């Protein structure tokens, strides 16, 4: 399916004051289902880092970021996450995908299973595309070879839904349902 997580870049600042007349603007890449969550995660880091809070700031740009292309490539996602079982595991897993958004959402499902880690426990720390060689991880390294061929072994080929059937004659594909 298309990626779970859209790629937002939320930009914002603490709102101007005589206390801080010309406040720093903050860019912040997020991978969120939708902007309202990206805007939220953005204000999470604003208070967890800048001590500025949602009441006192103002997002200047919620906009989603355009995909680099569509060619299959290779992503080093850097993903801190939390648990009672582990309170802050920095962890640069690599994923092979067509987009930063896809590598990242792929990193959430991966991270949610190997670690019972919800979206809001996780925080992406960056998602570089990587060249073939830099990927130390051995799993996706199997897919680098320009000459890689593999079988689609032991397929379950379900019929197109329009054609699916409950009962069929045994060495035939006459329907009987």
């Amino acid at each position: 399916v298309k990626p779970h997580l859209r790629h937002y870049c939320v930009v914002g600042r603490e709102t101007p004051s005589e206390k801080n007349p010309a406040p720093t603007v903050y860019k912040f890449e997020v991978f969120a289902p939708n902007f309202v969550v990206a805007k939220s995660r953005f204000w999470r880091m604003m208070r967890e880092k800048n001590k500025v809070k949602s009441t006192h700031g103002d997002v200047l740009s919620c906009k989603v970021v355009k995909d680099r292309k569509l060619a299959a490539r290779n992503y080093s996602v850097d993903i801190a996450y939390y648990s009672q079982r582990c309170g802050y595991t920095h962890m640069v897993k690599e994923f092979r995908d067509v987009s930063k958004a896809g590598a990242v959402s792929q990193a959430y499902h991966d991270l949610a299973s190997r670690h019972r880690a919800r979206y809001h426990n996780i925080e992406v720390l960056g998602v570089k595309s990587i060249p073939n060689h830099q990927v130390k991880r051995l799993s996706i390294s199997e897919y680098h070879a320009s000459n890689l061929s593999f079988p689609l072994l032991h397929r379950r080929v379900k019929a197109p839904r329009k054609d699916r059937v409950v009962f069929v004659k045994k060495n035939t594909k006459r329907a009987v349902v």
Binding site: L70, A72, V98, Y143, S146, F150
Partner: protein, 149 residues
């Protein structure tokens, strides 16, 4: 037959049902980038491998190959024009003609599927002379008992 870049998968169950398209580049083990200049709707996209059925055809090609390179190379083989030639392809366009068909074409078929099923018997009845059939073979031997009486 192995899936690799240049393999000519047949999309199965998606919005682009019957359509084929070359495997431009593997992503990981459960996805690929399908492509095919010959159809309008086979612009490069991420098919899942569950969704594709590899075909016996496969142009030689290099991963992440550009599309204009492909509208080239497959043209120099006509892997597509060659593919439609196969009964495996015709069967797909055949069912895709019956489903696409109007009611009078289905008359116009039944008249043939009887015109032929009728001559299947006419050929057979003529050939009924040569055994076997329950009606003729059973009877020729069946008389064997009658001649003995």
């Amino acid at each position: 037959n192995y899936i690799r870049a240049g393999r000519l998968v047949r999309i199965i169950r998606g919005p682009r049902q019957d359509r084929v398209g070359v495997v431009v580049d593997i992503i990981d083990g459960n996805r690929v980038l399908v492509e095919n200049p010959a159809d309008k709707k086979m612009w490069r996209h991420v098919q899942n491998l569950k969704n594709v059925e590899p075909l016996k055809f496969s142009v030689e090609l290099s991963r992440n190959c550009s599309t204009k390179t492909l509208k080239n190379v497959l043209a120099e083989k006509k892997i597509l024009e060659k593919y439609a030639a196969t009964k495996s392809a015709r069967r797909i366009a055949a069912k895709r003609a019956f489903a696409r068909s109007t009611d009078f074409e289905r008359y116009q078929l039944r008249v043939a599927k009887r015109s032929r099923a009728f001559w299947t018997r006419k050929v057979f009845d003529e050939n009924d002379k040569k055994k076997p059939v329950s009606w003729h073979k059973v009877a020729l031997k069946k008389l064997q008992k009658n001649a003995k009486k």
